[PDB]
Design a protein around this ligand. Structure first.
Ligand SMILES: [Zn+2]
Lengths: 57, 108, 124, 42
RNA sequence: UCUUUCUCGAUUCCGUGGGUGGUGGUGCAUGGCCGUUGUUGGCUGGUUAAUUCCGAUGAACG
């Protein structure tokens, strides 16, 4: 029962998923500080914001 | 023209404005606060090197082309005194602090 | 000769305790409307605010000056246009009684007492 | 109409004064009421 | 903490050295500082039966 530390999953080229070729594949946050650069998660049942924890279902 | 660019990047590190890295260049450019963009010409993958000029023209941002990235990295402050020499393929200056007038008249 | 309503617009001690604020100088020199005290032409100019405008805290700030100014004896003026004032407020007594506010309501009842103090239709 | 015309001029001057005052100036409580009492004895 | 990847980015994280590493408790001399051995003056706001409740907000004489 040793306390193992979390290791962050090194996703290879995580930058290269929000666009094709032009436009944005993912959603953008409608908040003031978050948005125009802040992408949203696209989960199988929800949308999640990595900055202000905004949740849309 | 590179001599007139070394002064405006140096005062950006003094005022801590510029954003190094591809994603920091991407995040700052579409926030309508970016002022100029620097692109390294030695990019192996062509899918991301052609995105940056599409993004800046959409947000009406001018573009500066530089041949080297490791030389770009050591100029923008990615080296310590240099033992480790690393570079970035893109960097965007957020805000400024003589030749900055020379740089802005070059586009016109 | 305006902007007195916008001086009461801010509710802060930094701009309430000033001499230029409504604490002291409004009670002295604004009664001289145009330099002569006291002209009721201001209250006879804001009917478009007391009619067809129910914006809160704008009718409240005009209610402050309505109570504050009429203390300084426009009594011959009060006699002639008493009916004009009475119809200008008997409809106010019905209007936000249907809405249910207090801040617009408390000073307009005091200025009614102010005009009634200086003075068949009167008992209504 | 003369009284109504002066009313518009009084309203136009007052609205310009409201912008001048702003230029010179230039449900969340109760949920945050709960969390500070949580922080009082956390 | 154990999975599904969402987001911050230099603020970095892995190992090896016989190479350095007091937030100690306790007593004495030690400089400043409190307490210790009279007299006269002087309201934006919401709250309640109620100048009710909460919120901002001085001087000489012996
Ligand atoms: Zn990254």
């Amino acid at each position: 029962p040793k306390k193992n530390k979390h290791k962050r999953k090194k996703v290879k080229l995580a930058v290269l998923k929000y666009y094709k070729v032009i436009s944005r594949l993912r959603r953008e946050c409608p908040s003031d500080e978050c948005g125009a650069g802040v992408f949203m998660a696209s989960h199988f049942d929800r949308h999640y914001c990595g900055k202000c924890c905004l949740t849309y279902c | 023209v590179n001599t007139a660019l070394q002064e405006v990047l140096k005062t950006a590190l003094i005022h801590d404005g510029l954003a190094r890295g591809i994603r920091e260049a991407a995040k700052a450019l579409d926030k309508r606060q970016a002022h100029l963009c620097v692109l390294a010409s030695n990019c192996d993958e062509p899918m991301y090197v052609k995105l940056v000029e599409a993004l800046c023209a959409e947000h009406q941002i001018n573009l500066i082309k530089v041949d080297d990235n490791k030389k770009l990295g050591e100029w923008v402050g990615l080296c310590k005194i240099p033992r480790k020499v690393v570079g970035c393929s893109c960097v965007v200056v957020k805000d400024y602090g003589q030749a900055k007038d020379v740089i802005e008249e070059y586009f016109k | 000769t305006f902007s007195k309503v916008q001086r009461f617009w801010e509710s802060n001690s930094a701009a309430h305790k000033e001499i230029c604020a409504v604490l002291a100088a409004v009670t002295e020199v604004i009664r001289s409307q145009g330099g002569k005290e006291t002209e009721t032409e201001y209250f006879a100019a804001l009917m478009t605010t007391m009619e067809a405008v129910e914006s809160p805290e704008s009718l409240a700030a005009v209610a402050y000056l309505l109570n504050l100014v009429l203390k300084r004896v426009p009594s011959p003026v009060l006699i002639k246009k008493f009916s004009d004032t009475s119809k200008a407020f008997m409809d106010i007594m019905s209007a936000q009684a249907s809405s249910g506010s207090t801040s617009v309501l408390r000073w307009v009842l005091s200025c009614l007492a102010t005009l009634l103090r200086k003075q068949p239709v009167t008992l209504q | 109409p003369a009284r109504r015309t002066l009313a518009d001029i009084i309203m136009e001057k007052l609205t310009e004064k409201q912008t001048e005052v702003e230029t010179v100036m230039s449900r969340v409580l109760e949920v945050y009421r709960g969390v500070r009492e949580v922080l009082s004895k956390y």
